[PDB]
Amino acid sequence: DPCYEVCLQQHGNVKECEEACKHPVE
């Protein structure tokens, strides 16, 4: 909920952030 929201404001992503939110970023 907050993750995406954060990206929504601090960014303009969708599937990238949404999917990358659960993915183990390097």
Q: What are the residues whose beta carbons fall under 8 Å from the beta carbon of 11, sequence distance 6 or more?
A: 17
Q: How far apart are CA 3 and CA 17, in angstroms?
A: 8
Q: How far apart are CA 23 and CA 6, in angstroms?
A: 16
- 7: tokens are 């990206």
Domain total for the chain? 1
Residue range of the domain that includes 17? 1-26
Rounded (5°) CA angle 22-14-16: 50
| Experimental approach | NMR
Contact status, residue 13 vs residue 7, Cβ threshold 8 Å: yes
